[PDB]
Amino acid sequence: TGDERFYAEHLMPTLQGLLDPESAHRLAVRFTSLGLLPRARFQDSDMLEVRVLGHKFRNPVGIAAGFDKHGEAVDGLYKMGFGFVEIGSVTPKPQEGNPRPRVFRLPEDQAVINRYGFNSHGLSVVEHRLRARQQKQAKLTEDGLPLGVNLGKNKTSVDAAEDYAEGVRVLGPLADYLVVNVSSPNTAGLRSLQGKAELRRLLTKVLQERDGLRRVHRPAVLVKIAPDLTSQDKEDIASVVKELGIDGLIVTNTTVSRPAGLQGALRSETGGLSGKPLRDLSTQTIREMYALTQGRVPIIGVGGVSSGQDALEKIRAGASLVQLYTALTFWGPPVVGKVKRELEALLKEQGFGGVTDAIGADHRR
Ligand SMILES: Cc1cc2nc3c(=O)[nH]c(=O)nc-3n(C[C@H](O)[C@H](O)[C@H](O)COP(=O)(O)O)c2cc1C
Ligand SMILES: CN(/N=C/c1ccccc1C(=O)O)c1nc(-c2ccccc2Cl)cs1
Ligand SMILES: O=C(O)c1cc(=O)[nH]c(=O)[nH]1
């Protein structure tokens, strides 16, 4: 509570005054990679444990893709108190991404806009980085701290499906789950991989490559979607996910929309918008996808989570797990313990025995 206020009121506003957002992001990854973090003194209650995607999750609060793009800070993120870590997006070949500046703060909106453009060390570098800690990760996973890997595609690739297939082959064996991110707003054409006969063809190839891995090295496969889909796109995705036995959905990526009421000077920058203005658009997308999949497809809920109330709203809408990113940039590492403490308190107040009991509760009212 002391360092929650110190981080929110003094340290983060001081860092944002001294460093542009991408510099601050880079420094945050370096500090995290060295374990230079405040005490994550919140101890996970049994109430927070979730069993989904073939794994135990000690707590349902994960770090979303895009913070640790290149798998440099995984151990530091568990030390921060995340129940699970997602690295990436990782592209087959190394690529630089967009020219700088490409990350923009909207302080008045508690939002960020980014157009990183899948800056990636590439699969080989990330493969060797995860191999160096593979057994340490096996023990973390067994102790309820799973690892996800988010797979992207290179800007100049002539075959999107083959880029994802390469990622399944190279990083699948090192991951508890993989994510096919057909929802970055910052690679031309990527989101059109969300339409039907082509999405079926893409996901069929990804699942075949996954099913070709040895049993102990066989990850869950999730599809990560945009909040910007049409009703037709969402019904098509739900249909294909059920038909192919996709293991879960991540709902949602950043929005290319600009909700009415943004105040930030940088609101008209090109890129994906994250944080508070995405929150309820994300929650509503979770609700719709949970209904279209009859509650049979696990959802990881993400977009504008900054409190236990935000986490519980996504859980009651249909999420089994949640992720956050943008809240960490505003409030720093103490926001993780804050979300967990508030979520545990709210579950008790609303008469839930644990997270599991709350999943999709709004659909049963
Ligand atoms: C700076 C930045 C970089 C991101 N890069 C990625 C990415 O590489 N892959 C991805 O799937 N999502 C990426 N995202 C999206 C987040 O994973 C998340 O879906 C989105 O930001 C909503 O969560 P939030 O409001 O808690 O930040 C990125 C988000 C931000 C803010
Ligand atoms: C600056 N910052 N992230 C910044 C950041 C990251 C991504 C995008 C934008 C920004 C931004 O500045 O607008 C963090 N710092 C930590 C952190 C990590 C370890 C120890 C102490 C801290 Cl405060 C986590 S995220
Ligand atoms: O630009 C990126 O790398 C990136 C940004 C974002 O918001 N989402 C994503 O999937 N990729």
* DSSP track, 330-359: HH-THHHHHHHHHHHHHHHHTT-SSHHHHT
Per DSSP, 362 falls in state G
Residues with CB under 6 A from ligand 2: 15-16, 21, 24-25, 28, 31-32, 36-37, 103, 105, 112, 328-329, 332-333
Cα-flanking dihedrals φ and ψ of residue 351, to 5°? Answer: 75, 30
- Catalytic status, residue 282: no
Residues with CB under 6 A from ligand 3: 66, 89, 114-118, 181, 184, 186, 253-254, 272
Q: Which ligand is nearest the CA of 302, by number?
A: 1
Q: Ligand 3 atom 9: the closest Cα is on which residue? A: 184
Cα-flanking dihedrals φ and ψ of residue 14, to 5°? Answer: -65, -50
CA dihedral 212, 173, 207, 190 (to 10 degrees): -140
Q: Which ligand is nearest the CA of 89, by number?
A: 1
Domain that holds residue 209: 1-364
* Burial (Cβ within 10 Å: 0-12, 13-18, ≥19) of residue 24: middle
- Say which amino acid occupies 323: Q
- Say which amino acid occupies 25: H
Count Cβ atoms below 10 Å from residue 307 Cβ, excluding itself: 18
**Ramachandran area for residue 273 (φ above 0: left; ψ -120 to 50: alpha; else beta):** beta
For the four alpha carbons of 85, 187, 245 and 168, in that order, the dihedral sign comes to negative
Report the number of distinct structural domains present in the chain.
1
Query: Binding site, residues?
Result: 65-69, 89, 114-118, 150, 181-186, 224, 252-254, 275, 304, 325-326
Q: Ligand 2 atom 10: the closest Cα is on which residue? A: 21
For the four alpha carbons of 202, 52, 364 and 310, in that order, the dihedral sign comes to negative
Resolution in A: 1.8
Give the determination technique. X-ray
* DSSP track, 38-56: ----PPPPGGG-EEETTEE
Task: Sheet containing 111-114: give its strands across.
Answer: 103-106, 111-114, 272-275
How far CA 202 is from CA of 69, 160, 164, in Å, comes to: 23, 8, 8
| CATH classification of the domain holding 2 | 3.20.20.70
